[PDB]
Amino acid sequence: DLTPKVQVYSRFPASAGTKNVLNCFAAGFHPPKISITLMKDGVPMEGAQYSDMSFNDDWTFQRLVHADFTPSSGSTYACKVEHETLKEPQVYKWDPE
Amino acid sequence: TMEARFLNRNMKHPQEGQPLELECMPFNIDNGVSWIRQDKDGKLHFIVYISPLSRTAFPRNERTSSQFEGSKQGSSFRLVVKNFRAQDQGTYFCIANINQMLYFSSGQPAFF
């Protein structure tokens, strides 16, 4: 399929109170138009940077969004992805530990 | 997809007594590949597993690392024959194990 394959992770192994970077990586999709939003408790996180768009040898596109944050126990972090292949935006929750 | 050719694109058939290099470009290289050999009975023989770090794992009847050797070159896995023998004739396949998925390259016949 040409739907986005999404993965949510942190730059370092997350510890409550220590600074880190939350990454959302979407790969293997087409067409390249896509929306990827990092969310702290359903609200878009601040300081999100969208990396340059590339593709693999199979011409499928990839995009990485990342944002600096301090992981808080008692806060849910997700990634919302919208694409033409999906009939509704898809949310991918982040497993902190 | 995947094919498995002779390294030399001019070579049609392998020669006796000389080395033979088999090339295999898999669509995914983040995982290793396994070389297998099918005989004339049709039974399948595992030859060697080549890892992405080029670290090879040979069968436990250890003596292929004496005969064949697996390596990585760029984005292509390579199986080398020091001496092509009569027992080295057969159909050679590349197998890629991506998640729980097996992908087979088109076999290369090494006969005559």
Add this chain to the structure above:
Amino acid sequence: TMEARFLNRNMKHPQEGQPLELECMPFNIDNGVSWIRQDKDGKLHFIVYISPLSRTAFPRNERTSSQFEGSKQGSSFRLVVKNFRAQDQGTYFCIANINQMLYFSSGQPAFF
């Protein structure tokens, strides 16, 4: 070590339009096995991976039984073809992947 034959051992040929039952007893059972099918040209097709917990992995990542059914029973993995068709003819192999090592059962010809 490991063979994988028809459950029905009197039966010589698989039949059209009906299910077809294959049993596979591997020497190691704590790891899953894969059913693959070779054509008459020799092309190799991945059919299914059956896990030790009986959780099936089908081509293109699917977990859905559209045509095939994989399961575990005692010390034997079982592959059924719900509707045996003309394109399901071929030589069926069981593959066990233990410690980066592949072990193959002798193939079984399923032809009309």
Add this chain to the structure above:
Amino acid sequence: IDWFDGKE
């Protein structure tokens, strides 16, 4: 260095 593509 990059280089310019051909016209199709």
Add this chain to the structure above:
Amino acid sequence: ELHTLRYIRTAMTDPGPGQPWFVTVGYVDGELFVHYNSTARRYVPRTEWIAANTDQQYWDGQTQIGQLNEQINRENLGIRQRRYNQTGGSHTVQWMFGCDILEDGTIRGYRQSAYDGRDFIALDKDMKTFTAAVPEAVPTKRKWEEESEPERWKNYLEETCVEWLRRYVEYGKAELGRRERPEVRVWGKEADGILTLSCRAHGFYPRPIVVSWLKDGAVRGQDAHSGGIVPNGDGTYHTWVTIEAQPGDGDKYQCRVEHASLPQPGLYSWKL
């Protein structure tokens, strides 16, 4: 000593709101180092070493090349759309080319294009003709074979590309050749009477790595669910592999990590 220089272009008709329709990016040894898009209209460095080893003439010439490619790709997108009798919608042209210096000292080169996710035209391995994957690419091939375009791109890939790749590998030796160890973390969660164990490796460099789940000392094969190697924001990489087991049975499994930065593979276990 495997080194690669790669350039990829994307020309879109539906890029998205506030997104450049034409984007070109370059990679040395997998690391992004140059970038051009149709909004900034200028080639820009993406690493400190490439900026620290180039003069303004370099970036001016590259920007000229990028703008010329913008115009050419606009027209090529239109032509490809019309050979398919297409008036509008989401259509994309992709280009991928470059050169590899492999560990045996040999040279490889490639230049392939795609239309709407599928192959369109490509310079073949002998670098003597162009191969059209679809009939709509046959006119282009004809034109490109009467303009001596195969030899032009052969001379680029076999020379200019390789020598500039050598220069880039010199400039970024310290960065490209560096080693960064992964921070590994084993985790476990139970649901529906199944115990999912996960092993995450964070922030490793270079990209090649192997993360295996051992059960009772034996490497598991198709029983592990891997996510592949995915990027971090800082040029490092990340991977995670899970495996399912019975409620309990936790001491049987180990995570093994093999990487260029670890003299011996790392072994990790769960600790609830």
